[PDB]
Amino acid sequence: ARRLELGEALALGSGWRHVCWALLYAPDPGMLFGRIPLRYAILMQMRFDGRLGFPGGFVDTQDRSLEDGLNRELREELGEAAAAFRVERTDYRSSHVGSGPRVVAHFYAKRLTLEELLAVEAGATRAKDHGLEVLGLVRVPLYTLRDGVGGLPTFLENSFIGSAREQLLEALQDLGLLQ
Amino acid sequence: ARRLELGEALALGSGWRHVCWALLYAPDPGMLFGRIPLRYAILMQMRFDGRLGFPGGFVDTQDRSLEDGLNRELREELGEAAAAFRVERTDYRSSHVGSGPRVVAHFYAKRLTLEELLAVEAGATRAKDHGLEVLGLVRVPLYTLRDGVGGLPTFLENSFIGSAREQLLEALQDLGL
Ligand code: NA
């Protein structure tokens, strides 16, 4: 897909929709079976349309900026625990020309505490969106199991919204969250 | 993949292993967007290997029964709120046998109240397996969006464990989908 600089993405015409996406993650010393290290807890969401994506949403008229809407979309999607933290410009990573009509996507990534992250998993089922535009949260498995396939490689065979799969890969590399 | 009656599978030597799956569902009057009926809320686990499947698991020998073992497995995976109900032999649907691995797979379905099922979802992250063998719970979308693609058919392009996708399609056919 077509990478764009943030400023050129804000410059696009009035017929463009802007959509904001957050990778929310925290460190995880946990060990699966006491032997495979999780390394980090990273969240993704099953969308209404059967696809895996990131938390976020379309920025609306009364949004004074990308971040105020992003955070607003998160609270609607994840519930009150999202209020504990605020995704900010420093967390911004990239902007992409999405798919379909005139849509451009902004990708953020925000390190939390494991308690913060867990507190968002635990309340996510009382949110406005849940059971409607949102079907379920899952953690991205960062390990590859003994048969060579189960874990991350298998998990990437799933359906992703737009280009989420590519943004995820890029972010695990840039943030060093594998190997 | 062959189909077996229960007593046939229960006769088989002790070294054969047993795996038991439960499809938990509940009527959901909900309307997605105000326009698309949900009909039923059904739950699926995303297992540790990246594959989606029903809650369930292997029986160990401290499990007396197919059902104790199944019901043991659900408490571990979904938490305390699984105790609201017990999956019984009356909810048995079928059994299947594989090629290579010597395991019989038994399939169950258990009708909940919607509040029962939401308590299972709400309580799910305090379950022992959460963040280890279970990565999270999804609902199954039973609709198809206008495009013929978004919804159930895309949900079906995910990766699944074993006979889950099939077991789901089987259960949807009986329910009136
Ligand atoms: Na599991």
Author numbering:
A (entry chain B): 4 to 182
B (entry chain A): 4 to 180
How does the study describe this entry?
Observing that His24 came within close proximity to the adenine base, we also designed H24W mutant to improve base stacking. H24W and F61S mutants behave as dimers in solution as shown by the size-exclusion chromatography profile similar to HsNudT16. Contrary to our hypothesis, the structure of the HsNudT16 H24W shows that the indole ring of the tryptophan, instead of improving stacking, protrudes into the adenosine binding site, as demonstrated by structurally aligning with the HsNudT16-ADPr model. H24W mutant had no significant activity towards free ADPr; consequently, the Km was not measured. The lack of enzymatic activity could be explained by the fact that the indole group of the tryptophan occupies the site of the adenosine and sterically hinders ADPr binding. This is compounded with the loss of interaction between the imidazole ring and the oxygen of the β-phosphate. The insignificant demodification activity with H24W mutant with protein-conjugated ADPr as well as its Michaelis-Menten results on hydrolysis of free ADPr could be explained by the position of the tryptophan in the structure, which suggests that H24W occludes the recognition site of the purine. Under the tested conditions, demodification assays of MARylated PARP10CD showed no clear changes between wild-type HsNudT16 and all mutants except H24W, which had minimal hydrolysis activity.
